[PDB]
Amino acid sequence: GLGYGSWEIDPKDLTFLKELGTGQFGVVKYGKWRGQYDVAIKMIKEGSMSEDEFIEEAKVMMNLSHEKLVQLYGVCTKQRPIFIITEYMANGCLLNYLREMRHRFQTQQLLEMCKDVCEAMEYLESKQFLHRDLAARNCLVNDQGVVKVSDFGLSRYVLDDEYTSSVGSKFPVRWSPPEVLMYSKFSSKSDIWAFGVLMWEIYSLGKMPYERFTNSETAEHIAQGLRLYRPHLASEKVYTIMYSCWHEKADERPTFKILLSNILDVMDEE
Ligand SMILES: *CCC(=O)N[C@H]1CCC[C@H]1NC(=O)c1sc2nccc3c2c1NC(=O)N3c1cnc(CC(C)C)cc1C
């Protein structure tokens, strides 16, 4: 209506129903939009985000739409704190979901989670949009068990320097390729590397990558050409796919289109 652009949600249209917890940007709630539609609401804690830059980018993100990508519905910007409104993912983040042993996953289900994420990443790649921080902690699970990619691109607007450079105590070292750690060279191939680590997290049921190492030791391990190794639940064919994401030379890593074909082949063969 009057006063709200196409990227802007009227917060008065929101009904807050349940607090989901607190993340890095702040509190996340479950609610309804105009009484009928499930939504997630992330309340951006003040001082945490580059808000004017994020809002301009939110206008571009409104045009990103894919079955396996968490849908941005809009932002609430007239106020502090601002809200990010999205489709609701009832089973929470993939990381905690993988760690609940009660699910007793079949490997067929684990590969489907990889395929879910890979389709979303191929879509983002087809739009020349880097995620820049892909990890199981960022993927979400809906009430049907479908995995979708979330938080895409948001690291660009984080003001806490501990998060934004490899020198920082909160940088995702364990998801980063050597050229990121050594030179800060981000590209589609640093998303590819992180996807390989995500595949490892999935088949490891949510273990920390390099769980016996510090970040500093992980960087040295990776820099010397050493890698994660095969999770007990990964077949040889599955391990070949995730390992292909970790070529020291970025240009020898596959695209998300090639990974998708490889994953579909293994689904057929297994
Ligand atoms: C393992 C990670 C974890 O523990 N997360 C916790 C942070 C607060 C409580 C936990 N979060 C959630 O359970 C959920 S459920 C859900 N559904 C939809 C969206 C989200 C969501 C969360 N947390 C979220 O942060 N989001 C969310 C993600 N990404 C964006 C950005 C846009 C462009 C997609 C927005 C939201 C609301």
Residue 94 Cα: closest atom of ligand 1? 1
- Tell me, yes or no, if 38 is annotated catalytic: no
Which CATH number is 92-269 given?
1.10.510.10
Determine the distance separating the centroid of ligand 1 and the alpha carbon of 231, expressed in angstroms. Answer: 27
Report the binding-site residues for clofedanol.
86-89, 154
Distances (CA, A) of 28 to 64, 143, 153: 22, 17, 18
Q: Cis bond leading into 172, ω under 30°?
A: no
Q: Phi and psi of 43, rounded to 5°?
A: -95, 110
CATH 3.40.50.300 applies to domain 11-86: no
| Sign for the pseudo-dihedral over CA of 135, 140, 145, 148 | negative
Q: Which of 133, 143, 160, 191 is catalytic?
A: 133
CA–CA dist 259, 196 (Å, integer): 10
In the chain, where are the structural domains located? 11-86, 92-269
CA–CA dist 58, 74 (Å, integer): 8
Resolution (angstroms) stands at 1.9
Distances (CA, A) of 42 to 30, 75, 135, 158, 236: 9, 9, 19, 14, 40
Judge contact between 53 and 159, C-beta under 8 A: no
Residue 89 Cα: closest atom of ligand 1? 17
Of 7, 44, 93, best ligand 1 pocket probe by most atoms within 8 Å of the beta carbon: 93
In order, the DSSP letters of 247-258 are -SSGGGSPPHHH
Token pair 């050229």 is at which residue?
Answer: 179
